Design a protein around this ligand. Structure first.
Ligand SMILES: O=C(O)c1ccccc1-c1c2ccc(=O)cc-2oc2cc(O)ccc12
Ligand SMILES: O=C(O)c1ccccc1-c1c2ccc(=O)cc-2oc2cc(O)ccc12
Lengths: 9, 214, 219, 214, 11, 207, 213, 216, 9
């Protein structure tokens, strides 16, 4: 399951 | 969206032409590069489920992605219905398809979102959408992190840019990302840079590495 | 449109130059591609019938389509008059009357009457009723102008599976004027019109496979 | 224009740069195609006569059209004076040139438009302007409906588009438009399509005809 | 006199 | 400018970047074609003298024209002082001189005071009238052609000729003949119409 | 900037993306042609010192000019400190406070909205315009003595160049008028000079320009 | 961001499309030229941590720089937790808790918590604290992307002095990530022979304006 | 000292 792309926050 | 008026009330406001066009254009220009998702999230600030559906539906291309997104949404709605089963001028309870805006009216969405306490159906739906979008972004990643190797004449900065662009799109867990940084980044620098970096020893910051190979 | 002002009151506001231009430009650039309909719906948020008519009247081309749209509108107004008849009789002047079909379409009603109905308690949403009729007509145009049948969408020998699925569901959306078009027949057809290699992989997956699984399998 | 403020008052608001530029550009780009008139009408929502004159006067080209328009305006003002003869802090009655904004001040226009009952001089003047614009659009129609004939290789949809665009510019009564639709449309289709349409029999709808030649 | 170009609505 | 806010009070508001840019661009693109003056007038709705001076001072080119305009402004200010001759009481409003109306010897706050006084002293509208008089003189000067040089070409459509005619007339006027300068065929048809014919009838006849 | 709200109060409002971009673009397109200064002044209407610094600092090129401006600002700040020396009470602004380097946004608002107001934004803007005036004069590409009508140059184009140069040079009005009175006619080309001499001095520019049209 | 409405109350407002696009475009067009930092600071006026993260996350390229920034942020957050530790323990119903470093960076705090902190009396300015951390990292990026050393800026044989000074202070700004004796020494030292002679004749304490007038 | 560039006002 992908971890998402929000590097910040 | 829902916005605050001067009377401290949360009230509906029409989605703007600027917002509509900004989203259409970012999908046209960036497709499903990772930064599309934060932009989606920012452009849908305060959105009702109706607004979120408007943004998704105004996309013309990429109908494979948009159908996959529908699949993800329906899976999340079914799970909602499993965890929150439902049974005169009173507020009914939303089912999964109500949160996704296909079986609920705008006025019902406003009622839920402005109720005390609020049922934030816009934010719930947005979460489901971003789950599907994340799956799309990962699937459409053109490159694997293992194939990112610094060219014999490639500036180190350009190599690192490619490395972390790929890592971002691939969306691994943070432990696997860390492993990649501690193992692959220096391992795949070109011979000269790799020598300098290994001489720096572990625990060096990315800033120190990049200064060293400039 | 009718909007809430900063103090919570429902008031009329002139349609904006940005809205006007956005609608003209989307019709000019996209014609009757399906995604024009959600855009129409969004640009007419809060619209009165007068605003909806402005948007339709500012379209320069596609005048055959506009005649068809006008005919759909007249059909829906007649259905309104059948299912929501207004008892005839003298109509006291200076008082809110009940809207007939031609009032909802803005042909026999004034802007002030439309505001009165839309801001009534409870509101009589003549703008949303009319918009439903318009979108029904526009959807018929979208289907009529769809260039290709879903049966003619077949994966090329070297065409990546993703591009074929893009073409397949674009075509389906236009032919139905709807994305809610996924059924067992459709997935059957997607696999059937796949190329030999992809078709073999897909048939090995078996039924019940998701689109994501199909696309991963043929990557 | 005249707008509603938060006190429920109708008050003057300066015409915006966006409105001004939009009108200039629509005249530049579309000249006197029929769709220019509804755009004019929409862009002048709430206009005072002064605003209407600003919109007309900022047009740079097309001075033959603008002079014809001025003449229609003068005719309508003269008819107003013929039908409404006008015999200390008290509001005077508008004459035709007051409605057209040449002999009235902005404050007088506001006074009339916000009076109880209102004298809607902006809407009266706009009606006159649109009468003039209608005559210009009819005059500048490039082709007669009699000369709209389907090309041997022209798709029927494109032919009907040309047919109804011409009909829109010519602005005949609905009865005259229907007569053209009932005789010319089929008469001037190309041989193959005309055969198919005649096979349909009389009384065919536009949707039916377009489907039949698709 | 011309009938106008407002295809939809009150004219 | 001075505008009414959402609660009905007259207040000063900064000139907007959109307005500033619109004026600069119209001067750059159209120079002193006549339609530039109505645009100026609309873009300065509610302007104080300070705002009008901002709009005039942001023009980069056309400095010859700007000097002509300045001379017109000073002439109008002199006539104002001739027709409205004027220490001050503490905390009291003084009367504007010609140079106050043009914004050279007055402050923004004084301009606001005059424009929002009851009754208002409309120094912005007076100054704008002076500016537009100067601008009309400039438009007439930049007109490239005399109405006498507008003759219908042998094979020029009558509409194009009329467009050129009235374009020229408008520029030359800023600060019977149409027929006489039509080409022979059109001229014959037009005179055949007789007198009292409208432009619409004339253009229809020569179409 | 500081704007008035519906309570009749003066309150802070963030500088807008439109203002920021407008200023960056005018510097990019016009450099230090004279009309840049009225544009600066108009785009900074109601600005705080922080906002003024934002506008200057977002400029990317022209760093020689920007350093000269900074030196002019520091000189003006020193003169202010010479002439205006300095619990729960409001302190007095020194020069670096007016220039926004030692003052907080909240202090700038406090000064600008106090009764009576200390208009630190307008004071700083005055200093900035002093520096910009000096840069515009320095960067003027041409001397008024070198503006001469070409044999085939229209008189209007010559006068446009003449007065653009004069505007950039920023001499006193007496010096400008002396230039108009001698150089303009002197440096016209032979034919125009003949006509303009026949008209004599004291003819208006409009009359001169019509005569040579 | 948090802004004052028309009646003087501090309220949350969605970040605007104009702001989002302005930031994305300035990064695309200028990369990390120094003037991007003041632009960042102006475009994030009143921003919450959520808004600041939106701005950083919408950047598509420059992922090396973004990783460096993430590291700078984490370092500043760790220092915050050391110097401003939050007493661990129970939760007080209806009461404002104190932010830790990850709350200021918007990773472990909600938008509603951020609004609560920023509009409290007195305000806990988590947006401005985070913005200070972000600008620290961005200045590090600007310095690293500076292409040239000030020692390599020497007036060309025919180069106008004005152009040389432009290159000189452009370079100094990028190398320091800021516009603020060795430097003037260096300016004269690396001027071309004729200009250097004139400038040395002017002596010490001459202003840049006087130097540029002297070598024009 | 330069006179400034504000031709008007
Ligand atoms: O939704 C309905 O069927 C309905 C029932 C009573 C009155 C109006 C409607 C109705 C609408 C009600 C709300 C709304 O937003 C839109 C509606 O549209 C309608 C369209 C119809 O042709 C016919 C009816 C409607
Ligand atoms: O340095 C300060 O002003 C300060 C004092 C107490 C608490 C926080 C801060 C502080 C800030 C206060 C206001 C402000 O606008 C910005 C601040 O930034 C900080 C950054 C830190 O790393 C660490 C601290 C701060």
């Amino acid at each position: 399951s992908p971890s998402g792309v929000f590097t910040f926050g | 969206p829902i916005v605050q008026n001067l009377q401290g009330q949360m009230v509906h406001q029409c989605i703007s032409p600027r917002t509509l066009n900004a989203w259409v254009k970012v999908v046209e220009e960036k497709a499903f590069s990772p930064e599309v998702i934060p932009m989606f999230s920012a452009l849908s600030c305060g959105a009702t489920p109706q607004d979120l559906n408007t943004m998704l539906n105004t996309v013309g291309g990429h109908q494979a992605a948009m159908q996959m997104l529908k699949e993800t949404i329906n899976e999340e709605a079914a799970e909602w219905d499993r965890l929150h089963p439902v049974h005169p001028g009173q507020m009914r309870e939303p089912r999964g398809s109500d949160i996704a805006g296909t079986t609920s009216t705008l006025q019902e969405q406003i009622g839920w979102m402005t109720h005390n306490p609020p049922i934030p159906v816009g934010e719930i739906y947005k979460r489901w959408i971003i789950l599907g979008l994340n799956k799309i972004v990962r699937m459409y990643s053109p490159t694997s992190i293992l194939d990112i190797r610094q060219g014999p004449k490639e500036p180190f900065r350009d190599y690192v840019d490619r490395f972390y662009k790929t890592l971002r799109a691939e969306q691994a867990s943070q432990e696997v990302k860390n492993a990649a940084t501690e193992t692959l980044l220096v391992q795949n620098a070109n011979p000269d840079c790799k020598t300098i970096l290994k001489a720096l020893g572990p625990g060096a910051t990315l800033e120190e590495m990049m200064t060293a190979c400039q």
